[PDB]
Amino acid sequence: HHHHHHPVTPCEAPLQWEGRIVLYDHNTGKNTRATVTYDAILQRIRILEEKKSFVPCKRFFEYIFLYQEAVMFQIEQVTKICSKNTLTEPWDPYDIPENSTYEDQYYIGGPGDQIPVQEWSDRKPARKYETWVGVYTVKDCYPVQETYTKNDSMTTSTRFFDIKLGISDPSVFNPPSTCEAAQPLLMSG
Amino acid sequence: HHHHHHPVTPCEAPLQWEGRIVLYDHNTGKNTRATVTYDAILQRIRILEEKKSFVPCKRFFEYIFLYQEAVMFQIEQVTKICSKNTLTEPWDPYDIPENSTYEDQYYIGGPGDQIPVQEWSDRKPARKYETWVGVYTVKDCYPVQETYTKNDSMTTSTRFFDIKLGISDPSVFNPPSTCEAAQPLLMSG
Ligand SMILES: [Ca+2]
Ligand SMILES: [Ca+2]
């Protein structure tokens, strides 16, 4: 039997990638499926909601968050109606904060196809419940899952997949021409 | 470019295994870490809660659910005080119901260590929100994650890992001697 040190700090998540996610929102119970272009160097993130067959939702959005310019564009994918809004909130990366609490390492999957991952949190002894848990791969530190009990009880779980390093198509961060735009509230049905 | 049929039915999850889980309960915000012995053939499941350093919780339980006998034993791991209770609810396997809606297939992880998985749900067009989403491996159909918006807004996400087929230690389903026991309500702090 052998004794593995707990890691002194967490691995460093990739800075740029193209991937896909599911965002599960318990306040609404909604699962949102999106293609994501993520760039922590410029602190921008582009989210393209996906439509599946016969979902009861008519409206689907593209989001372009440009934190270095304190603006977010939201575009109805059909109408192409744009909303330009101010971003007050600071950038938040998909990574493990360097002061996170190490929780575990384990294998996801079966024999012959299993992947080692690590789990980290913001657990400390002064607080009964964590607000953040992250599951990242051991080998490349890619995000796998995060749950965020953030926002005073407004919680989400995000699952990450089909991630590919780098950004093959930068143009996605250019807002469309219809984005000579004002600050409308666009929400889904 | 190529066109993959959607699967006509889902893969068949393993019937017996030993593994570990994290159960994230939004009603409380709690993350419970447990070692699990799972047996769908006898419809029994043994859950052993894990204690981590300096969690503010004093009480940790072992559960032995024996659905074929409509009884569940709950044991305080320290005191060894047992509770024997009646099970009214039918067995529910960790599997994909054969009438589930196929949602997606994708790779978790990075280049050189990534695992293909499938996602299934209980989505139908008559209901805005799913009550159940399951993520299972393609290769062996091992559970990876489930979220359950079951119970009229009482929702959980479960993550599965370190799964090994078969049950190396059957004795765990034998209740301990202190289980000449009554029906106490034992809850955590
Ligand atoms: Ca973050
Ligand atoms: Ca089930």
Residue numbers in the entry:
A (entry chain A), B (entry chain A): 30 to 218
What's written in the study?
Orthologous proteins to ependymin called ependymin-related proteins (EPDRs) have been found to exist in various tissues from sea urchins to humans, yet their functional role remains to be revealed. All of the EPDR1s fold into a dimer using a monomeric subunit that is mostly made up of two stacking antiparallel β-sheets with a curvature on one side, resulting in the formation of a deep hydrophobic pocket. All six of the cysteine residues in the monomeric subunit participate in the formation of three intramolecular disulfide bonds. The EPDR1 fold is very similar to the folds of bacterial VioE and LolA/LolB, which also use a similar hydrophobic pocket for their respective functions as a hydrophobic substrate-binding enzyme and a lipoprotein carrier, respectively.
The frog EPDR1 structure was determined first by direct phasing using single-wavelength anomalous diffraction (SAD) from a xenon-derivatized crystal, and the structure was subsequently used as a search model to determine the mouse and human EPDR1 structures by molecular replacement. All other contacts bury a BSA of less than 500 Å2, with no conservation in other crystal forms. In the frog EPDR1 crystal with only one monomeric subunit in the asymmetric unit, the same dimeric interface was formed between the crystallographic symmetry mates [BSA of ∼2300 Å2 per subunit; Supplementary Fig. S4(c)]. Also, the β8–β9 and β10–β11 loops in frog EPDR1 diverge significantly in comparison to those from human and mouse. Although we do not have direct evidence, we have modeled this metal as a Ca2+ ion, which is likely to originate from the 0.2 M calcium acetate condition that was only present in the crystallization reservoir used to obtain the frog EPDR1 crystal. The Ca2+ ion is octahedrally coordinated by four water molecules, the side-chain O atom of Asp121 and the main-chain O atom of Pro122. The four water molecules coordinated to the Ca2+ ion are further stabilized and arranged in place by hydrogen-bonding interactions with the nearby residues Asp124, Glu175 and Tyr177 [Fig. 3(c)].
